[PDB]
Amino acid sequence: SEQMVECQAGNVRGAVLVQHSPIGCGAGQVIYNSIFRNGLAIRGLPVENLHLISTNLRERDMVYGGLDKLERTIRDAWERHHPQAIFIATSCPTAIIGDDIESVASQLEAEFGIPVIPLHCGFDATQHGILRQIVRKNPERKQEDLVNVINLWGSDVFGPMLGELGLRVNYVVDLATVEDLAQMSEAAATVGFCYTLSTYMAAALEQEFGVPEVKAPMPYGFAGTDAWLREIARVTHREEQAEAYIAREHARVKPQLEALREKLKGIKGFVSTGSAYAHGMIQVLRELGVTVDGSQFQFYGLLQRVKPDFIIIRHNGLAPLASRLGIPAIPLGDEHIAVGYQGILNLGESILDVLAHRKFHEDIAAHVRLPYRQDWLARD
């Protein structure tokens, strides 16, 4: 989860993430920068590089520790960017030497007057730190029409959907300004489409600050979206708008689903993700009529056993291997693809798209040799 913690902490706009570790552990800066820029572009916000600072530890620090270097790096971050918050991330080579980041963090927090949050890397260090030090306490303002939506990335799917309910969306944590994180205690509810991700932070928000958490079926499939929207409306007292939106969307979407079903008839899929997320995708596929068998060498064996037309995955490294077997994968960089009523059609025509791309993957499969020995191929 260290990569996810670093990505979340560095994706908070107006904040600076300090990587207390050798230069090697900062290699993720390029990955995080690419994800950050693409998320900004998708969200429509101005695009720019993120500024992650590494303490750049060397042998001297591995021996005698790097507290002085950490303090120097935090001062550098403050002077260069004057952020609204500073996070600190610690790697294995720095965990082994057992540097005490808490003391310097508290001291510099007192000196600068902004949060200095040492990330300790069901639970998430970045979310815990945001709640501890950034989320406003006993707010004097309550936003009855504000809802916290906990997501990693993806386009504005909840924006328009909840707009039809007259509700505003507060996207956290990624791409959120420090102002947005602070005001999450003012929102009228916290909706998390991802049970695994959003459960901890939303539960803590409700318990400590009184912002209700919406616990309902995920917005996947017609029934799931119906229940989800109705729960949102009940919590935020917008039943009339929710019913109007549901009727409109049912009328608009139900026809096209027939043509989509005809086009997707006979297609066999495959899903391999967290049971929570996989459940929604499998529900949407069942709506479209696609067949699902159920839920990196073991992946090779699984794909050989099943031989699906397409796969749905959410972890890196799985797709390239499936590509070499001739199986396209649904690109879930935007996890919001299948959310809501329009999500059904989006996923349907995305499946139709990746079925066309099968031509590339079949060529690759024909003209490549995998690095696995033949004998190992005869094992499960």
Find the shortest distance in angstroms from Cβ 55 to ligand CLF.
12
Which residues in the 292-331 window bind other proteins by CB under 8 A?
Answer: 296-297, 316-324, 328-329, 331
Strands 52-54 and 143-151: unpaired
Which residues are near ligand CLF by CB under 6 A?
22, 24-25, 91-93
Question: For residues 196 and 213, what is the distance between their CA atoms, to the nearest angstrom?
Answer: 14
Residue 131 DSSP code: I
Site membership for other proteins, residue 252 (CB under 8 A): no
Number of residues that bind other proteins (CB under 8 A): 84
Q: Select from 53, 104, 191, 205 the one that contacts other proteins (CB under 8 A).
A: 53
Q: Virtual CA dihedral for 180, 191, 165, 286, nearest 10 degrees? A: 140
Q: Which is nearer to other proteins, 204 or 339 (CB)?
A: 339
Which of 3, 85, 98 has its CA nearest to residue 51?
Answer: 85
Among 102, 144, 258, 353, binds other proteins (CB under 8 A): 353
Please work out, in degrees rounded to the nearest 5, the angle formed at the alpha carbon of residue 83 by the alpha carbons of 80 and 89.
Answer: 90
CA atoms within 13 A on the CB side of 144: 6
Q: Is 255 in the site for other proteins (CB under 8 A)?
A: no
Q: Please name the residues in contact with 11: beta carbons below 8 A apart, sequence gap of 6 or more.
A: 32, 35, 36, 39, 50, 173, 174, 175
At its nearest, how many Å lie between ligand CLF and the CB of residue 234? 44
By a kind-dependent CB cut-off of 5 to 8 A, residue 73 interacts, out of ligand CLF, other proteins, none, with other proteins
Q: Which listed residue (14, 38, 139, 295) binds other proteins by CB under 8 A?
A: 38
* 89 burial level (CB within 10 Å; 0-12, 13-18, 19+): buried
Residue 167 or 312 with smaller CB distance to other proteins: 312
Contact residue for other proteins among 59, 140, 262, 380 (CB under 8 A) = 59
3-state secondary structure 148-159: EEEECCCCCCHH
CB of 68 to ligand CLF, least distance (A): 19
Q: Which residues contact 338 (CB under 8 A, 6 or more apart)?
A: 220, 280, 281, 284, 344, 346, 347
Nearer to other proteins, 292 or 332 (CB): 332
Q: Does 116 bind other proteins (CB under 8 A)?
A: no
CB nearer to other proteins: give 159 or 217. 159
Q: Do strands 187-191 and 143-151 pair parallel, antiparallel, or not at all (unpaired)?
A: parallel
For residues 67 to 106, the per-residue mask of contacts with other proteins, x marking binding by CB under 8 A and - elsewhere, is --x--xx--xx--x----------xxx--x----------
